[PDB]
Amino acid sequence: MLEGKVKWFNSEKGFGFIEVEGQDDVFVHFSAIQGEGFKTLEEGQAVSFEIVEGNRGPQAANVTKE
């Protein structure tokens, strides 16, 4: 699992970017967010996650709020 920080997140639209040291920023969609409750992220929130890449390029998967 990768560790990173939420760079920014549009809570209304349900998407943002995770920033991570060395690597580029990682697009995160709300459907990647684990746990219970309404799925959203806060700027600067610590997350653990993976990067999954299909034919639309890399994005965050299995994002867990730490």
Numbering used by the authors: 1 to 66
Sentences from the paper on this structure:
BsCspB is a relatively small protein of 67 amino acids length that belongs to the cold shock protein family. Notably, BsCspB shows an overall thermodynamic stability of about ΔG° = 10 kJ mol−1 at T = 298 K and possesses fast unfolding, ku, and refolding, kf, rate constants of about ku = 12 s−1 and kf = 1070 s−1, respectively. In previous work, we have used auxotrophic E. coli strains to incorporate fluorinated phenylalanine (Phe) or tryptophan (Trp) amino acid residues into the Cold shock protein B from Bacillus subtilis (BsCspB). Our findings show that fluorine-labelling of proteins utilizing singly modified amino acids like Phe or Trp does not cause a detectable alteration of thermodynamic and structural properties of BsCspB.
Focusing on phenylalanine modified variants, 4-19F-Phe-BsCspB deviates most in ΔG° from wild type BsCspB by 1.5 kJ/mol. This property of 4-19F-Phe-BsCspB has been one rationale for the crystallization of this variant enabling to obtain atomically resolved information (see below). The fitting of Eq. to the data obtained for 4-19F-Phe-BsCspB using one-dimensional 19F NMR spectroscopy yield TM = 318.4 K and ΔH = 176 ± 6 kJ/mol confirming the thermodynamic analysis done by using 1H NMR spectroscopic data which has illuminated TM = 318.5 K. To investigate potential structural changes in 4-19F-Trp-BsCspB and 4-19F-Phe-BsCspB, we have elucidated their atomic structures using X-ray crystallography to 2.05 Å and 2.1 Å resolution, respectively. The samples crystallized in a closely related crystallographic lattice, containing one single molecular copy of modified BsCspB in the asymmetric unit and sharing a same space group symmetry. The global RMSD for all Cα atoms for the 4-19F-Trp-BsCspB and 4-19F-Phe-BsCspB structures calculated in this work is 0.23 Å, indicating that the fold trace of the two variants is virtually identical. Furthermore, wild type and 19F-derivative structures displayed identical conformational rotamers for the modified Trp and Phe residues, indicating that local structural distortions had also not taken place. Interestingly, these slight changes are independent of the number and sites of fluorine atoms which have been inserted into BsCspB: one fluorine atom used for 19F-Trp labelling (sequence position 8) or seven fluorine atoms used for 19F-Phe labelling (sequence positions 9, 15, 17, 27, 30, 38, and 49). To our knowledge, this represents the first three-dimensional structure determination of a fluorophenylalanine-labelled protein possessing more than a single fluorination site which has been reported so far. The analysis of both the unfolding and the refolding reaction of 4-19F-Phe-BsCspB leads to almost identical values for fN, namely fN = 0.191 and fN = 0.189, respectively. This result shows that 4-19F-Phe-BsCspB folds fully reversibly and that there is no apparent long-term folding rate constant additionally present which may explain the gap observed in the amplitude analysis of the kinetic data.
